[PDB]
């Protein structure tokens, strides 16, 4: 009926995911959760013709936007979109509405991974997840005011992996996001992968 907006907050932290890999019996779990996210986004875009997708990652040294791609794409050498530098990660016989969004997001994933590898020498003691879904609600309101209506929803791909405990700086911004999401009636969905059973603030 009424289309919605699927905003997704991805928590990428090399320490968290690699401690999940060490605690688990497998290596490369983030590839699995990444392709699961991709088929989820395809399912969401299959749900309705006009619903939209936003995905945001919260890496160690800040946050970056994964889909939709930054507006620096200018059909130049630094366009980095569509056929320009279209490195074959997903098959080209894909549905084009799925193909464009998935190929763009995986290219942005590889670019973020390259940038984070380039700054692997510095270990951040600050987690950028709370500001990440803060900007998620900000883009939610951007879509809501630009398009007249449209629903919205958040997905949180968080990971504890038994290494990061419940932090104290993640108290105030999380409830700021709670009140903001309650203002625009945006549900907040959180899935936590790791050995830590309970995350009280996210609950």
């Amino acid at each position: 009926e009424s289309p919605s907006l699927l905003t997704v907050i991805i928590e990428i932290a090399p320490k968290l995911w690699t401690t999940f890999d060490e605690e688990g019996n497998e290596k490369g779990s983030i590839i699995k959760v990444l392709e699961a996210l991709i088929v989820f986004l395809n399912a969401h875009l299959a749900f309705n013709s006009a619903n939209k997708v936003a995905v945001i990652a919260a890496y160690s040294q800040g946050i970056k936007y994964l889909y939709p791609e930054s507006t620096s794409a200018l059909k130049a050498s630094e366009s980095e979109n569509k056929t320009r530098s279209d490195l074959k990660i997903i098959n080209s016989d894909m549905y084009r509405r799925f193909r464009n969004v998935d190929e763009t997001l995986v290219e942005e994933i590889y670019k973020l991974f390259e940038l984070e590898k380039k700054q692997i020498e510095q270990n951040s003691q600050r987690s950028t997840l709370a500001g990440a879904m803060s900007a998620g609600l900000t883009y939610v309101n951007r879509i809501s005011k630009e398009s007249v209506s449209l629903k919205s929803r958040l997905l949180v791909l968080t990971c504890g992996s038994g290494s990061s405990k419940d932090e104290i700086f993640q108290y105030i911004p999380i409830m700021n996001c709670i009140f903001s999401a309650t203002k625009m009636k945006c549900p907040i969905d959180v899935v936590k992968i790791g050995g830590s059973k309970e995350s009280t603030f996210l609950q």
């Binding site: 009926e1 088929v39 395809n42 399912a43 299959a46 749900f47 309705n48 013709s49 006009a50 056929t83 997903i90 098959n91 016989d93 894909m94 549905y95 084009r96 509405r97 799925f98």
Partner: protein, 452 residues
């Protein structure tokens, strides 16, 4: 309307034809959109898991506030043959359609698509400069043909035979003109996506030949919905049947092939408009003295305004017209009922009558708060005049048929009259006058009743 219409059409599809239709991922993706959101959610939840899920789990999934919606979705998916109901362990086990599930998973997980989405040849133009006005011209050609205004360009014979076999667009060649039915202006009521949908369901009701199958037509229209505008596609994936309908809707303008037998066909914006939707042009002004001031510049809006409004002049902004009696007579001799014209006036009213209408409704509620009145966007004087013209069209009504009289016994008259009343063909009866009349459609039934 639209979703209900295509759902009832695909209800008419046989189960084996539906199962063959579920082969392509594009068809499964298209029909996935046509399910209700509860139905869509349950189907996609059933897609990824090979194990079959009992119906009690799905019933427990739904809150009590949406039990009716859940039952309606169950009815829709059962009628759509997407479920295999299984009877095991005293439970009505439910399994998804396997071909549908596999094709939809391939459409999601990037599996086998067999080029159901077409292939891009990377030679293309912009839609606005070439494709958009071509689609507009090809649509307006058949529109201005069917409204009856003279044209320098007339469409092909295929759409003419389609309109002849259609319920609308009655044709006469001994006179030399094309008569518009009520269903014609009903077609002009809805917006062009559902217009295209009704056109294509009438097309599928037309095409029964051995030259054309059915699943290929549905595959082609659903991939045309799946195609994107601004990139050409190669004709090789289509069958020769799908190629001759590619030519057929190239004549329609749904697709722009720049020349016949070319290998590159360009999707037009009507292809994306077909799936789902998204002061205006055609917004008109009516007064107490039946005057028409239409903010319209497209020829189609003022062309369909010409059928029921005596147009006096036309500016670059306005079309000066007047609702005369004779224009309304021209409408009603086409079968165009008055209420539909009233609805057309309501949908095309200017926002200034809208603000004055909410103003007078505010005055009505501040004067008589005990009662509430509907928002009459246009004054009731012109509406009353149109209704009086409609009533004076049919001051006398002439029902034709047969009448039985001359009964020497009252029981024979009573038995024949109650037989006519039971089959619902009697129009009048009285034992004093010893006469009763029956309709023309009920003449033959009562005649064979009396003969036997």
């Amino acid at each position: 309307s639209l979703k209900h219409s295509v759902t009832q059409y695909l209800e008419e599809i046989p189960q084996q034809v539906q199962n063959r239709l579920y082969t392509s991922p594009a068809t499964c993706l298209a029909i996935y959109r046509i399910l209700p959101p509860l139905a869509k959610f349950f189907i996609m939840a059933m897609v990824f898991n090979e194990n079959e899920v009992p119906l009690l789990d799905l019933d427990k999934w739904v809150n009590s506030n949406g039990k009716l919606q859940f039952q309606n979705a169950i009815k829709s998916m059962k009628s759509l043959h997407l479920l295999i109901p299984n009877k095991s362990s005293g439970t009505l086990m439910i399994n998804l359609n396997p071909t549908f599930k596999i094709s939809l998973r391939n459409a999601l997980t990037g599996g086998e698509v067999q080029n159901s989405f077409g292939v891009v040849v990377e030679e293309n133009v912009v839609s606005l400069d070439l494709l958009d006005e071509y689609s507009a011209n090809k649509w307006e050609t058949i529109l201005h043909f069917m409204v009856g205004t003279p044209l320098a360009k007339i469409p092909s014979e295929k759409v003419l035979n389609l309109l002849k076999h259609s319920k609308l667009m009655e044709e006469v060649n001994s006179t030399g003109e094309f008569k518009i039915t009520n269903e014609g202006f009903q077609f002009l009521l809805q917006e062009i996506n559902s217009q295209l949908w009704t056109l294509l369901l009438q097309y599928l009701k037309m095409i029964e030949t051995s030259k054309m199958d059915l699943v290929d037509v549905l595959h082609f229209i659903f991939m045309l919905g799946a195609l994107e505008v601004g990139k050409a596609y190669k004709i090789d994936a289509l069958s020769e049947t799908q190629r001759i309908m590619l030519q057929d809707m190239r004549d329609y303008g749904l697709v722009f092939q720049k020349h016949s037998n070319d290998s590159i066909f360009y999707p037009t914006k009507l292809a994306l408009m077909l799936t789902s939707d998204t002061i205006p042009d055609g917004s008109l002004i009516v007064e107490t003295n039946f005057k028409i001031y239409s903010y319209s510049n497209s020829p189609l809006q003022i062309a369909v305004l010409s059928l029921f409004v005596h147009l006096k002049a036309r500016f670059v902004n306005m079309v000066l017209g007047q609702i005369t009696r004779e224009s309304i007579r021209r409408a009603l001799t086409n079968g165009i009922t008055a209420d539909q014209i009233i609805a057309y006036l309501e949908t095309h009213a200017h926002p200034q009558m809208r603000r004055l209408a909410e103003e007078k409704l505010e005055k009505k509620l501040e004067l008589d708060p005990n009662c509430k009145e509907p928002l009459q966007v246009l004054p009731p004087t012109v509406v009353d005049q149109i209704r009086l013209w409609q009533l004076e069209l049919d001051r006398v009504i002439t029902y034709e048929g047969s009448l039985y009289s001359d009964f020497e016994t009252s029981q024979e008259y009573n038995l024949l009259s109650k037989y006519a009343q039971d089959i619902g063909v009697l129009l009048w009866k009285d034992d004093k006058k010893k006469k009763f009349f029956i309709s023309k459609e009920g003449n033959s039934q009562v005649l064979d009743f009396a003969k036997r």
